[PDB]
Amino acid sequence: WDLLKYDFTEERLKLFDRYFKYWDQTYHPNCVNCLDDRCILHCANFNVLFSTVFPPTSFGPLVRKIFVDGVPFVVSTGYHFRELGVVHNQDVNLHSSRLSFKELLVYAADPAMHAASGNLLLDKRTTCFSVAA
Amino acid sequence: RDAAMQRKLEKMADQAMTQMYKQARSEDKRAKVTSAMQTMLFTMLRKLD
Amino acid sequence: VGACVLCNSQTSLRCGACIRRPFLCCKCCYDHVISTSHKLVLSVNPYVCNAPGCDVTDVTQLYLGGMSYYCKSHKPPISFPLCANGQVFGLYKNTCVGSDNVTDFNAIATCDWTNAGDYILANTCTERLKLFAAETLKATEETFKLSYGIATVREVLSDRELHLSWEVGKPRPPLNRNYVFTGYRVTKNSKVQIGEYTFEKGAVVYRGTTTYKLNVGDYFVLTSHTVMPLSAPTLVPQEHYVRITGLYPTLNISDEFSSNVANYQKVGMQKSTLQGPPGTGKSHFAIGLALYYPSARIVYTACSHAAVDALCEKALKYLPIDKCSRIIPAVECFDKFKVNSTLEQYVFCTVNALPETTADIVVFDEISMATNYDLSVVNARLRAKHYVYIGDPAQLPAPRTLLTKGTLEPEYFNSVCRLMKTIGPDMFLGTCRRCPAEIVDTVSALVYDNKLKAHKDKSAQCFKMFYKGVITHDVSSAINRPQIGVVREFLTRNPAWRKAVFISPYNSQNAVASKILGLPTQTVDSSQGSEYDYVIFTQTTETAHSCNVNRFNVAITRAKVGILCIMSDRDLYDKLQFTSLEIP
Ligand SMILES: [Zn+2]
Ligand SMILES: [Zn+2]
Ligand SMILES: [Zn+2]
Ligand SMILES: [Zn+2]
């Protein structure tokens, strides 16, 4: 697969049509469009099944470059859950001017800059995915 | 009357002084932590390649 | 939490009615509020009624109840006035000295900077109040700039000319070189600067820093910037030395600066002021100081970018190019030195962009334009063994737009210009190389107490003429066309004078003369630092602006060889040691 590909909606629909064709209830690949809690569970089950086919490197925060005061950051503006699909932030602020205490608190907490500024890690002691040191 | 109208205001004045001492201390610590967070962001950005 | 400006006592009380909000101790703030209309005082929290929907803010009508400020109507039964017993309630109430008189601070704080006495008290109070006055004046100027209306491009006839529609309900600025605007580009939901502009009456003639194809929709405002609170004094404590301290003389000097050797040793023997008449070698003085002390690191500072670049020019002809640097903040200036190298041996920068660094000698050129605000930041950004103030109090300082009443003397331009006008200058350039004997002798008796000496002889090409003419006024200037007509008649009979540069104290007079005469035109304020072979001067009025002795000094001292002066004032005409000519 392409390393930069994060939206596998078409593949999810292809698999659902392939194996669960006559399952009457509708299926939402992205749970942001679900109707209530019960539909969220119903679609998250199928996403749980279908997310074991896609590369593990495509799941995680969707980071994006933003400009402030002429200085570019690399900040998280979404997520790609194995269960809930793709979620996009609604209040992404591009070309901002100042960071208040709230914005400084938000940007200092996400793993975007911490992971992007660190060096690569390959830990042979564990099977769990390792991102950075 | 007047001596019991006075020695009970020295307590509230002292309490006010301590409270606004505390609030000033908090407001200085806030500025310190703000500067620390901003400079940390700006120094970790410079390794970005 | 800070230090009382009058007392230096630690205090957390600041006057919220004043635009600068300086710290004031309990007694000081009490006297300041009870004596003026200043009633808003700020503490760690504001002294304002906390009752829902109440507007009582005056310091004397509030009480502390519980943990809050209330008016008399909404106070709880248990309350205590914060304004009583001759002090205002605040931090560190036990530690308080007070002052006998707060009259000077009351005057400086509550004034509007329209009276000459305002600047007099600003330059004659104690150091801390001088700093307060400088910050308050600058903040008042920046706020006054915002009161001006926005001018928007309504039509573009041609290049270098524009049409401006002005905002309703607001005044329009005086259109001249002292009001540098800035264009803005209309975008989807924001605005972007498009450079700094200046306007002049055409339709308006615009001279922006950077050229474009600006169209309808773009607008101009006078850019304001935040005024930062000053801590360092206008002048460091003066100390005199018996030997050379921290400095190591070079043993080989050329005859170019051999005349300056005595003044160079004076700089190294104290913590120093120089008055330099026009065309005397002010840069010639300063650059050799770098040569006279080659192991020394010297910072070069000045108010404007143009003057800073002038110091960069002469260093090119003398100093190493790898040992220098031009500090530029994030206008087109000197771009031959390495940019933004603070640690280099020679530092070239403006006052407003000085980095926090130390050097052996700091030289501040053209001290005339400087104000106490620029003096203080130099001391705050630079800690040096020796400070050299070079300039001329007899030339133009920075314009004072807010001032309308009274005339400003050289002693009040700033704290430095205060010194040589009372106690004299540490160094002085007594030899004028630019002006011929007629011009120098005129200005030597005028403002230099007959101490300026001529290097050139009489040129016999210096004339003066007395002609009132007719005075006409536009929105923000004055025009004397009959004086311009005299110049035209003079030019026909003396065609050799068409290489001259026209000078006048009014921008509108230059504009009319530029079209009629065809000569290059410069205002007296803009002509400081430049030298021309021939100049034609029209006073154009008898107002204080045109009759100012410092301004009349600059206008007539621009001539290399000859000058023609058409006077409306009898006083300055008689003071001109010139060849009188008759009106045709
Ligand atoms: Zn669903
Ligand atoms: Zn005080
Ligand atoms: Zn005040
Ligand atoms: Zn109230």
Curated annotation (Swiss-Prot), chain A:
Inhibited by Remdesivir antiviral drug (GS-5734) through non-obligate RNA chain termination. Zn(2+) 9 binds at residues 28, 34, 39, 43. Residues 1-97 form the Nsp12 Interface domain. Its cofactor is Mg(2+). It catalyses: RNA(n) + a ribonucleoside 5'-triphosphate = RNA(n+1) + diphosphate; a 5'-end diphospho-ribonucleoside in mRNA + GTP + H(+) = a 5'-end (5'-triphosphoguanosine)-ribonucleoside in mRNA + diphosphate. RNA-directed RNA polymerase that catalyzes the transcription of viral genomic and subgenomic RNAs. Acts in complex with nsp7 and nsp8 to transcribe both the minus and positive strands of genomic RNA. The kinase-like NiRAN domain of NSP12 attaches one or more nucleotides to the amino terminus of NSP9, forming a covalent RNA-protein intermediate that serves as transcription/replication primer. Interacts with nsp7 and nsp8 to form the replication-transcription complex (RTC): nsp12, nsp7, two subunits of nsp8, and up to two subunits of nsp13. Interacts with nsp9. This is RNA-directed RNA polymerase nsp12. The gene is rep. The chain holds residues 4660 to 4792 of 7096 of the full protein.
Swiss-Prot record, chain C:
Changing residue 228 to I: In strain: Omicron/BQ.1.1. It is found in: Host endoplasmic reticulum-Golgi intermediate compartment. It comes from the Viruses. Changing residue 263 to S: In strain: Omicron/BQ.1.1. A ribonucleoside 5'-triphosphate binds at residues 276-283. Residues 430-584 form the (+)RNA virus helicase C-terminal domain. Residues 1-112 form the CV ZBD domain. Zn(2+) 12 binds at residues 15, 18, 32, 38. Zn(2+) 11 binds at residues 4, 7, 25, 28. Zn(2+) 13 binds at residues 49, 54, 71, 74. LRR repeats lie at residues 223-243. It catalyses: ATP + H2O = ADP + phosphate + H(+). Residues 252-429 form the (+)RNA virus helicase ATP-binding domain. Changing residue 255 to Y: In strain: Epsilon/B.1.427/B.1.429. Interacts with nsp8 to form the replication-transcription complex (RTC): nsp12, nsp7, two subunits of nsp8, and up to two subunits of nsp13. Interacts with host TBK1; this interaction inhibits TBK1 phosphorylation and decreases by 75% IRF3 phosphorylation, which leads to reduced IFN-beta production. Plays a role in viral RNA synthesis. Multi-functional protein with a zinc-binding domain in N-terminus displaying RNA and DNA duplex-unwinding activities with 5' to 3' polarity. Activity of helicase is dependent on magnesium. Binds to host TBK1 and inhibits TBK1 phosphorylation; the interaction with TBK1 decreases IRF3 phosphorylation, which leads to reduced IFN-beta production. This is Helicase nsp13. It comes from Severe acute respiratory syndrome coronavirus 2. The lineage of its organism: Viruses, Riboviria, Orthornavirae, Pisuviricota, Pisoniviricetes. The chain holds residues 5326 to 5917 of 7096 of the full protein.
